[PDB]
Amino acid sequence: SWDKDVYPEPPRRTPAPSPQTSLPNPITYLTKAFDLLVDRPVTLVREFIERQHAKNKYYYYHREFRRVPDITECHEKDVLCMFEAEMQWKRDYKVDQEIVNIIQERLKACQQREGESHRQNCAKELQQFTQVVKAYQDRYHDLGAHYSARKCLAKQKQRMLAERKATKEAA
Amino acid sequence: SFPKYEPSRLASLPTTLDPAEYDISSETRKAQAERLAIRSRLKREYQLQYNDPSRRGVVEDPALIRWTCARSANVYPNFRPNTKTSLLGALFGIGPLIFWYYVFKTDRDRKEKLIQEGKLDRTFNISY
Amino acid sequence: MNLFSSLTLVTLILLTMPIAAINFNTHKFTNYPLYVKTTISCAFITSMIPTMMFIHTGQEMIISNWHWLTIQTLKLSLSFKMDFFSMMFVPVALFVTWSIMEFSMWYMHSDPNINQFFKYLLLFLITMLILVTANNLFQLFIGWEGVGIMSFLLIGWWYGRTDANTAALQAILYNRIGDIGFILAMAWFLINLNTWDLQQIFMLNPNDSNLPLMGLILAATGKSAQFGLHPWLPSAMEGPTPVSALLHSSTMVVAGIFLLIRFYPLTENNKFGQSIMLCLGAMTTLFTAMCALTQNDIKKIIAFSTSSQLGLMMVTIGINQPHLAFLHICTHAFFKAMLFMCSGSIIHSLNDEQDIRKMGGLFKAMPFTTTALIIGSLALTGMPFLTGFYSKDLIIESANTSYTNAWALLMTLVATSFTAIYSTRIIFFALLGQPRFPTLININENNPFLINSIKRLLIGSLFAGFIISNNIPPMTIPQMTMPHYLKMTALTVTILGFILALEISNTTHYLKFNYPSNTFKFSNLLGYYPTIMHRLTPYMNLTMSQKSASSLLDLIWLETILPKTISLAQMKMSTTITSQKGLIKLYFLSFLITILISTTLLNFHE
Amino acid sequence: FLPSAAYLTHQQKVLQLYKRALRHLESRCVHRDKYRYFACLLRARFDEHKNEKDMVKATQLLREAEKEFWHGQHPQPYIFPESPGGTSYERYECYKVPEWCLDDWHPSEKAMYPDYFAKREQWKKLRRESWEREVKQLQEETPVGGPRTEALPPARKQGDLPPLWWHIVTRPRERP
Amino acid sequence: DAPPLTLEGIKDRVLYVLKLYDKIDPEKLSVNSHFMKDLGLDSLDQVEIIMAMEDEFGFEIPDIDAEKLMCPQEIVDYIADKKDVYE
Amino acid sequence: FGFSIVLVLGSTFVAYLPDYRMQEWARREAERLVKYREAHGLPLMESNCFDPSKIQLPED
Amino acid sequence: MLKYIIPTMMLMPLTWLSKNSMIWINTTLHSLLISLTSLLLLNQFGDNSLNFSLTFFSDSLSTPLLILTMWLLPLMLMASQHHLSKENLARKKLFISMLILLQLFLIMTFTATELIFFYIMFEATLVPTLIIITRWGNQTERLNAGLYFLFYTLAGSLPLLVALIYIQNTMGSLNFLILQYWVQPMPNSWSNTFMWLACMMAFMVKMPLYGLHLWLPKAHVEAPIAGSMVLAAILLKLGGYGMMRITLLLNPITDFMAYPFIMLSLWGMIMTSSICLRQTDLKSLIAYSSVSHMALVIVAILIQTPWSYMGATALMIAHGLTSSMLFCLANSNYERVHSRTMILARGLQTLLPLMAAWWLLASLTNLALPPSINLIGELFVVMSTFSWSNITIILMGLNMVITALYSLYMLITTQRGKHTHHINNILPSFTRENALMSLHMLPLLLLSLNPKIILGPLY
């Protein structure tokens, strides 16, 4: 399963079709035949397989980590500090890429659910998409292929120093 | 009623209207006869090397081997660097290279100046 | 929803089992054509159902699974959808190709390589179906190059025949220019919108849409046989006949403009884009219309005809009316599949003489194929309520009632007159005149599969145009308010074209033998474009390949600059050093001048 | 560029002109009856000055005839579907598998076809037995050091097969 | 295409469409007769004859051969060679 | 020993294995972290990945 | 990694003290077992690389290339009979042991922790290939080919050693982590520019780029099939591997100084794809094809995008497989007819009915067929270079058009239309050649199903 609050779904809206005239309705007979020829046997097969699964019990756990301190607390060379620092940063980088993947899947799903009126009830998700992706464009973008962690902190210092000069001019 | 059929390097002059075929020297008759003799001797040698029931492999065409070794290995001799060869070499080898190098310098200087000003459409330009 | 998704996926999955049949064969079949025909019939009869559910309810959907290389901020899966176009197109293609399976049981019966032929043609259907179902743009690219290379193979079916593999090489060359256009569009979409996904791209509306739409125009005019890159189409006709039928009636030629029909929310804007669209469409329409006149082969006439129809569809995209263009795709597909199949019936019945000279008397030589040709070449023009009325005449009505380029209107008008007159001339020289074809005749249609296929497609091109074109939700505003002489003008132009072609026919009845006046040449030699470009650009590139690349730059200059100068320097220095005759006075004078040159000239004790 | 001679003839050149112009008039002129009229007009135009006793006037009229023909040719002439450039032109070159092969089969497939392989064995014995002395003596007996033609002589001495017959007899059927 | 052909059919059809021609006669027309030598028609009309056989049987024969047919027996023989008329 | 034990067993081995280059772990960790950061007010992926409390700029 | 080093040693006396007509079976069987055991390596996960010592360690760039080497060994060791099956037992054993020793130095080179060790095993790979191509070159300019190979690859590769010693004694050790985690930017002086030009120019020689590419085609048309396939696939993709590793240093000056190499690579990619359109000598077309695709690889390495490095390693592996297979089909046709030319060996659709499928499928994997790995590599290189500049995609697509043109001309020239009907010696296709074709193609399609392996460090 999945949380309904990270992959959100609006509530369902489904009409009840009122037939004006009486031919009637080939697809209703065909979907009842579909139910009787497909829906029952696959349900019986899945129920058998689920009983065979629930005879025994496996479990897999989620791997979790700790917070090794910083790269801002590591010294000149000290390779057994920078190692834990940059692996912690690289795992943050992977999980942040997947944050961007989740938001972009939400944008795709808002496109396909809301139909031929795109701009109704997709303003909020496009807003948060441009927000998180503006953060990504600011934070990880223009460093290249040989990122380790140190070019990211150099970009951090250079950007906040440039904005410090900008707000000094704005003072 | 004729536009005289000017030829070109791609529209070949056909065998009908030469019109040098219609005023004939006797030496051209001798030339056509000896050319027929050459092709007849070549076909005779080929057909005798062609219908042997004992022969198994290929016929070893010497003109094809001669053309191949003329085209691959025998280009480098003969050669001398002439004014024409040096001119055409430095034209086809360096000219377009330095042209595309100038246009890449121009485009990259425009792009880096424009993003130093920052007025590009990189509102989201993620997959760089 | 269970039924809808499950039946679309089994319509895709039934076209994998005969490939398993040939791969796991090991004991060679005989009824493999029967197997492929009945599985295509089953695929159509399961593809009718979710379209019926689509019109009955609505309910569009996408499916997307099995993601591979979910690397950066993007991710790509096998992701395909069914919307209005994406499942209103599929039963038409399956129906057309099932009739071509009938006709290719018949026509290719006497060639013992039939199993590999149906393998290739089924695989071609699979690839074009993958092209018309996908929304992931990379999967569209997969279907693109796959139908390009199956087009290569099916054009070059008859090995031998240097015309055929020349044709196939030209077709694959113009398809790679379609590829450079399409990858330029793909690059712009990746770099400016983080993906190639039609949902997100349509979710935004990027306003600087110049570079991608130029790439789309280049890809469409490469794939859809249009001006600049058009002349591969009669050359593509030079292969087998059901090959040409499937390859240029329904599939493989609409895939250029089907991309532009897909990208309608991005080409809503950009007036420059629509201007390029309809200028290119009008240019193709007049050019292949005038080029279709004075052509004396059947298949080249039909190729120029379908190029003119794709020209009208590019006009239909230039005016903001994509759904009419899709309706024209469907009706056009039925129609020219039926026309190709009828001409292939005649050509195999008449010992493959294949040309319009020496073709004449065929009416009452059993007139089933003449009925097929008169229904067809009637339906090509605007006949007031037949299948060819709806699409083409709504196209010219919506083209006339719009803010158009004012010359493209005249081009489409004149080329409608031209398609009237070559339709009349193909009827007159194919069916009507005095019989000019050699004796010992065995004209034969007492034949089950031929009459079943022609029967099925005439029943198609009489009713299914109306059946398709009526029960669809109106996705645009129909114009419906025209003056006089703007609605009548379609029938007016087709009737004046019929009068013009019939008087040209009655002048052909005369005997005068007029000399040509070079417009006859300009319309007769395929235009001067194929001869001029195919003698220049193979000569220019390879003349600069022998001189510059082959002999000049790599071999002779690079082998002089890096090996030769170094090796000659080493050779000359060695022949100056070691060339010493053995006199001792020279060696000790060298020692003495070395001692002096180390003491007083270049100091070593200081 | 012909096997038997070096130059065609004068008459042969006029005759090829007549066949090419008559074929292009076929292709130009449909309905076959106005064709027949124009073909008899062309035949009369050749008849009007056929009996001129000069020779330089003959080549004069021939040269101007090629000019006024190449003015009035047809762009796509109706060539038959076996000629070069035609519609088929070795359509069925797919299936012309030559008969130096078919000896490289497995002997079970050779056990499927007994009689044809036995008769191929006797034809191959007929090839090998009558190759050396007869054919090579007739090819190195009658010619001069220069052959000067490409017509090769028949075998009329006493007995057996003509020289150099194998890859001319055993060619494929051209409609397999 | 499924035609059957034999030597009888090609012989009778070639002799038929030579019999139908105008300025010769079916009275003295054997299978073995020359064109210039005894029928007495000119070489121009002999190439018209060759054009008739080409337009009937549906395939070109070259002028490297069309110099030297001259008699309907060799015509029947040559077209039977080109079509390979046996089973 | 080139197909029946190499190719097919290699296909089963690299068909599925532990999650190569930590992909599905990244999926599940991102699901948990987006659920957390949406349930606690703050915007998901706050910028400035290094805390500006823990930075010292050179002065001017 | 020692568990892969030591059975490669132990597979060498196998070949000596196996008896006559039994060296073959034992070497093929045991090298295929080594290939399975090699495929068991693929463990590499997430954060770090994996360390198989302070001596051996594997990045995820090195894993598919290592499996490619230990997979291309048995394929070659079967590929190299019928042109030395009549030779002596001692010379045969010497050839097979030379291939085993070349595999050993290639594994040494791909799991090289230190760049000094990488250089030593780089030219240790260089050593046996000269002996192989010179002793079994089967043509008259094999001396010229091996000698140009030697002096080009040394005289380019040699000041790289001086630059590596200078980095060794100015920044401590040369483990890739401590070369990493410590690397400081090197500003726009001139000595830094010459150090960059030494290292990058050594690998420029090895790839090759256009001004240094006549190195290659003599060493392929004048060489046996074993030296040809190992030379092309493993040596050029090893050069690319080395440039990928050493480009982590010298970060700022590559923007200043890396424009003319991009230029020479692009324009020479176009000129090389043009020169392999009109040549004879069927073997040479694949050689200049390899020059074109590795010029594309060089453009991909010198621009420094993660998309570019993923596309680079995918293009490396796919082109290695495709060019090695296509060399092998060229040798198959040369064993059919002793020609080496192209316009002679015509026909071959009628005869040899199954070989058409392998020619077509190899030509389509060279065509950049879209689900294949070759188009994945070329597509990501095109994406990255259009991010580099908006104008250079014209050269990429023009390369694409000409590449499809010459590859499909190479298909429809040799194997389309009419046998020359004077050949009459070609036998039907053996099971060996088709086994080799199936060993080439089927890993490429099975990687086309799941390409998460071959994408490199920046997955």
Tab-separated table of C-alpha atoms in Angstrom, chain C residues 40-220:
chain	number	residue	atom	x	y	z
C	40	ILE	CA	-5.243	-9.779	-36.692
C	41	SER	CA	-9.000	-10.399	-36.951
C	42	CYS	CA	-9.123	-11.190	-33.229
C	43	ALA	CA	-7.061	-8.069	-32.473
C	44	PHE	CA	-9.564	-5.927	-34.374
C	45	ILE	CA	-12.555	-7.600	-32.731
C	46	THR	CA	-11.050	-6.820	-29.325
C	47	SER	CA	-10.098	-3.303	-30.440
C	48	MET	CA	-13.674	-2.396	-31.343
C	49	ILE	CA	-14.881	-2.693	-27.723
C	50	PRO	CA	-12.971	-0.016	-25.697
C	51	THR	CA	-13.581	2.549	-28.440
C	52	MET	CA	-17.306	1.861	-28.052
C	53	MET	CA	-16.871	2.399	-24.307
C	54	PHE	CA	-14.941	5.615	-25.061
C	55	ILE	CA	-17.760	7.167	-27.091
C	56	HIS	CA	-20.402	5.811	-24.680
C	57	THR	CA	-18.880	7.333	-21.544
C	58	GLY	CA	-15.747	9.369	-22.149
C	59	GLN	CA	-13.172	8.074	-19.654
C	60	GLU	CA	-9.771	8.582	-21.177
C	61	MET	CA	-6.803	6.902	-19.549
C	62	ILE	CA	-3.062	6.343	-19.454
C	63	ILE	CA	-1.189	3.283	-18.246
C	64	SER	CA	2.466	3.461	-17.234
C	65	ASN	CA	4.608	0.685	-15.786
C	66	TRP	CA	8.025	-1.014	-15.669
C	67	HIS	CA	10.235	2.026	-15.269
C	68	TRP	CA	13.831	1.551	-16.385
C	69	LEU	CA	16.665	4.068	-15.926
C	70	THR	CA	14.824	6.314	-13.487
C	71	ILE	CA	18.117	8.130	-13.195
C	72	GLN	CA	17.847	11.903	-12.609
C	73	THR	CA	14.827	14.138	-12.007
C	74	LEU	CA	13.151	12.369	-14.940
C	75	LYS	CA	11.950	8.794	-15.162
C	76	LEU	CA	10.707	6.833	-18.153
C	77	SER	CA	8.560	3.715	-18.168
C	78	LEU	CA	6.666	1.865	-20.827
C	79	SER	CA	3.915	4.463	-20.773
C	80	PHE	CA	1.076	4.492	-23.242
C	81	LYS	CA	-2.364	5.977	-23.262
C	82	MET	CA	-5.672	5.933	-25.040
C	83	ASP	CA	-7.348	9.259	-25.739
C	84	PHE	CA	-9.494	10.507	-28.631
C	85	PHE	CA	-6.850	10.113	-31.348
C	86	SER	CA	-4.920	7.304	-29.675
C	87	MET	CA	-7.790	4.858	-29.802
C	88	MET	CA	-9.900	6.324	-32.579
C	89	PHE	CA	-6.994	5.504	-34.925
C	90	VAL	CA	-6.162	1.898	-33.888
C	91	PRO	CA	-9.265	-0.025	-35.178
C	92	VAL	CA	-8.932	1.671	-38.575
C	93	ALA	CA	-5.313	0.534	-38.902
C	94	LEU	CA	-6.111	-2.995	-37.724
C	95	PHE	CA	-9.076	-3.245	-40.121
C	96	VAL	CA	-7.020	-2.014	-43.092
C	97	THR	CA	-4.182	-4.380	-42.279
C	98	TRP	CA	-6.534	-7.366	-41.913
C	99	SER	CA	-7.816	-6.691	-45.423
C	100	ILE	CA	-4.204	-6.446	-46.579
C	101	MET	CA	-3.606	-9.860	-44.951
C	102	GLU	CA	-6.375	-11.191	-47.209
C	103	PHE	CA	-4.924	-9.561	-50.326
C	104	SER	CA	-1.401	-10.683	-49.404
C	105	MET	CA	-2.594	-14.230	-49.012
C	106	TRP	CA	-3.668	-13.920	-52.619
C	107	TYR	CA	-1.078	-11.711	-54.344
C	108	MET	CA	2.023	-13.253	-52.774
C	109	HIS	CA	0.835	-16.862	-53.006
C	110	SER	CA	3.234	-17.833	-55.792
C	111	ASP	CA	6.409	-16.725	-53.980
C	112	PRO	CA	7.854	-19.301	-51.543
C	113	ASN	CA	9.240	-16.709	-49.088
C	114	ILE	CA	5.836	-15.782	-47.673
C	115	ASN	CA	6.532	-16.576	-43.997
C	116	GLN	CA	9.354	-14.050	-43.598
C	117	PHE	CA	7.165	-11.536	-45.435
C	118	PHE	CA	4.297	-11.846	-42.970
C	119	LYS	CA	6.805	-11.812	-40.105
C	120	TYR	CA	8.167	-8.458	-41.316
C	121	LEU	CA	4.733	-6.979	-41.981
C	122	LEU	CA	3.333	-8.021	-38.592
C	123	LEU	CA	6.403	-6.557	-36.875
C	124	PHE	CA	5.800	-3.350	-38.831
C	125	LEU	CA	2.220	-3.254	-37.512
C	126	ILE	CA	3.520	-3.750	-33.952
C	127	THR	CA	5.913	-0.837	-34.300
C	128	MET	CA	3.374	1.573	-35.784
C	129	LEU	CA	0.905	0.607	-33.049
C	130	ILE	CA	3.546	1.392	-30.409
C	131	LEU	CA	3.954	4.747	-32.171
C	132	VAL	CA	0.237	5.581	-32.038
C	133	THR	CA	-0.355	4.505	-28.438
C	134	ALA	CA	2.548	6.100	-26.545
C	135	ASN	CA	2.739	9.360	-24.606
C	136	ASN	CA	6.348	9.054	-23.464
C	137	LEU	CA	8.167	10.881	-26.244
C	138	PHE	CA	11.143	8.497	-26.272
C	139	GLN	CA	8.716	5.653	-26.953
C	140	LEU	CA	7.381	7.704	-29.876
C	141	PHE	CA	10.983	7.845	-31.084
C	142	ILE	CA	11.241	4.047	-30.758
C	143	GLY	CA	8.155	3.588	-32.929
C	144	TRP	CA	9.532	6.215	-35.341
C	145	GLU	CA	12.835	4.561	-36.171
C	146	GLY	CA	11.310	1.085	-36.005
C	147	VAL	CA	8.769	1.830	-38.720
C	148	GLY	CA	11.576	3.538	-40.638
C	149	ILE	CA	13.692	0.414	-40.699
C	150	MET	CA	10.774	-1.949	-41.385
C	151	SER	CA	9.972	0.386	-44.274
C	152	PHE	CA	13.580	-0.091	-45.419
C	153	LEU	CA	13.214	-3.873	-45.392
C	154	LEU	CA	9.775	-4.051	-46.991
C	155	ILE	CA	10.812	-1.669	-49.764
C	156	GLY	CA	13.945	-3.744	-50.291
C	157	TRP	CA	12.033	-7.026	-50.195
C	158	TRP	CA	12.936	-8.057	-53.741
C	159	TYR	CA	16.686	-8.418	-53.482
C	160	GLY	CA	18.263	-8.058	-56.769
C	161	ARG	CA	16.666	-5.063	-58.514
C	162	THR	CA	19.022	-2.116	-57.805
C	163	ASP	CA	16.031	0.247	-58.113
C	164	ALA	CA	14.559	-1.360	-54.986
C	165	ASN	CA	17.544	-1.027	-52.680
C	166	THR	CA	18.221	2.445	-54.124
C	167	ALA	CA	14.637	3.257	-53.114
C	168	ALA	CA	15.136	1.818	-49.654
C	169	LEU	CA	18.348	3.805	-49.185
C	170	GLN	CA	16.560	7.039	-50.162
C	171	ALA	CA	13.718	6.234	-47.753
C	172	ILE	CA	16.048	5.595	-44.831
C	173	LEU	CA	18.026	8.770	-45.640
C	174	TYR	CA	14.980	11.026	-45.484
C	175	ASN	CA	13.898	9.201	-42.334
C	176	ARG	CA	17.205	10.117	-40.680
C	177	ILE	CA	16.560	13.752	-41.563
C	178	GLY	CA	13.238	13.225	-39.801
C	179	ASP	CA	15.366	11.909	-36.932
C	180	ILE	CA	17.574	15.030	-36.719
C	181	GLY	CA	14.450	17.209	-36.588
C	182	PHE	CA	12.839	15.042	-33.925
C	183	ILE	CA	15.929	14.861	-31.713
C	184	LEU	CA	16.262	18.648	-31.880
C	185	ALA	CA	12.706	18.888	-30.537
C	186	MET	CA	13.530	16.249	-27.904
C	187	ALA	CA	16.622	18.180	-26.807
C	188	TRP	CA	14.673	21.409	-26.383
C	189	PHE	CA	11.991	19.613	-24.354
C	190	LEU	CA	14.589	17.996	-22.080
C	191	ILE	CA	16.601	21.115	-21.408
C	192	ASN	CA	13.720	23.557	-20.944
C	193	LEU	CA	11.036	21.375	-19.324
C	194	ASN	CA	13.067	18.639	-17.504
C	195	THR	CA	11.340	15.810	-19.383
C	196	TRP	CA	10.020	14.316	-22.548
C	197	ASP	CA	6.497	13.622	-21.297
C	198	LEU	CA	3.390	14.880	-23.041
C	199	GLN	CA	1.385	15.292	-19.832
C	200	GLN	CA	3.850	17.728	-18.261
C	201	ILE	CA	4.666	19.468	-21.558
C	202	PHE	CA	0.972	20.099	-22.150
C	203	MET	CA	0.614	21.057	-18.475
C	204	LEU	CA	2.847	23.985	-19.124
C	205	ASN	CA	2.683	26.298	-22.103
C	206	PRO	CA	6.238	27.453	-22.809
C	207	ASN	CA	5.975	30.563	-24.930
C	208	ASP	CA	9.381	30.502	-26.661
C	209	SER	CA	8.246	27.588	-28.822
C	210	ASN	CA	10.340	28.352	-31.902
C	211	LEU	CA	13.180	25.792	-31.842
C	212	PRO	CA	11.008	22.761	-30.867
C	213	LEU	CA	8.295	23.517	-33.405
C	214	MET	CA	10.914	24.025	-36.122
C	215	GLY	CA	12.297	20.614	-35.182
C	216	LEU	CA	8.775	19.187	-35.347
C	217	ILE	CA	8.229	20.710	-38.794
C	218	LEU	CA	11.503	19.170	-39.971
C	219	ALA	CA	10.573	15.752	-38.548
C	220	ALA	CA	7.101	15.875	-40.112
